[PDB]
From Swiss-Prot:
It is found in: Nucleus; Cytoplasm; Melanosome; Cell membrane. The TPR repeat-binding motif mediates interaction with TPR repeat-containing proteins like the co-chaperone STUB1. ATP binds at residues 36, 78, 97, 123. One of its GO terms (cellular component) is cytosol. GO terms for biological process: activation of innate immune response; cardiac muscle cell apoptotic process; cellular response to heat; cellular response to virus; chaperone-mediated autophagy; chaperone-mediated protein complex assembly; mitochondrial transport; neurofibrillary tangle assembly. The gene is HSP90AA1. ISGylated. S-nitrosylated; negatively regulates the ATPase activity and the activation of eNOS by HSP90AA1. Belongs to the heat shock protein 90 family. GO terms for molecular function: ATP binding; ATP hydrolysis activity; ATP-dependent protein folding chaperone; CTP binding; dATP binding; disordered domain specific binding; DNA polymerase binding; enzyme-substrate adaptor activity. This is Heat shock protein HSP 90-alpha. It comes from Homo sapiens (Human). It comes from the Eukaryota. The chain holds residues 16 to 224 of 732 of the full protein. Residues 1-209 are annotated as: Interaction with NR3C1.
């Protein structure tokens, strides 16, 4: 069963802006997504200090980077707190509404896209390089869900039936045909050693057969 939703008007506008604006420094998407995953890991770690049973769904706190040249996908896997169905449908869009509006005022005030994470909406920078984004997430207090959107004002949420994750978030970037450089090993190594050397968790780059 798949439910389709509409993006709240403001982030429907931000996403079209990101997709349609000619902007060459597209590599900052990896910094933001890794930065988001690091925030997700910080959250589950802080909760475990007052409740070690929260790590029963997995103790390893790390981030994995998985390119796939055949499928033309770059997957980012963290073992952070994960996300609930209310997070994917309402809660985050409500916290982001002010950041989206503020980010768009700043874009006219001279600021460029690279500062998107400063407004707490850096996840949508994925659409700089991805035509479709699929998110598999698992929170301690919810089932496993699958989130997907190809921009255009709508997204879908369904109960995932594939391989269980235990706990964490998996962001699958179905890359644009001209953005395949982000599937190359030395390119990903450069972005991580230029944008995210000071992340407090291991960042493993899965290299291909
Ligand atoms: Br899936 C998914 C959906 N929305 C978001 N955000 C909204 C504002 C900031 N992040 N993150 C992940």
């Amino acid at each position: 069963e798949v439910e389709t939703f509409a993006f709240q008007a403001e982030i429907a506008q931000l996403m079209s802006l990101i997709i349609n604006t000619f902007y060459s420094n597209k590599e900052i998407f990896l910094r933001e997504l890794i930065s988001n995953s690091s925030d997700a890991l910080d959250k589950i770690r802080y909760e475990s200090l007052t409740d070690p049973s929260k790590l029963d769904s997995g103790k390893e706190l790390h981030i994995n980077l998985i390119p796939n040249k055949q499928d033309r996908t770059l997957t980012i896997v963290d073992t952070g707190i994960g996300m609930t169905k209310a997070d994917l449908i309402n809660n985050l869009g409500t916290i982001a509404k002010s950041g989206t509006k503020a980010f768009m005022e700043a874009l006219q005030a001279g600021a460029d896209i690279s500062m998107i994470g400063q407004f707490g909406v850096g996840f949508y920078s994925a659409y700089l390089v991805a035509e479709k984004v699929t998110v598999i997430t698992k929170h301690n207090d919810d089932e496993q869900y699958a989130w997907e959107s190809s921009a255009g004002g709508s997204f879908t949420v369904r109960t995932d039936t594939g391989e269980p994750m235990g706990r964490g978030t998996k962001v699958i970037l179905h890359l644009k045909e001209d953005q395949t450089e982000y599937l190359e090993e030395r390119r990903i190594k450069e972005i991580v050693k230029k944008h995210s050397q000071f992340i407090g968790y291991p960042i493993t780059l899965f290299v291909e057969k």
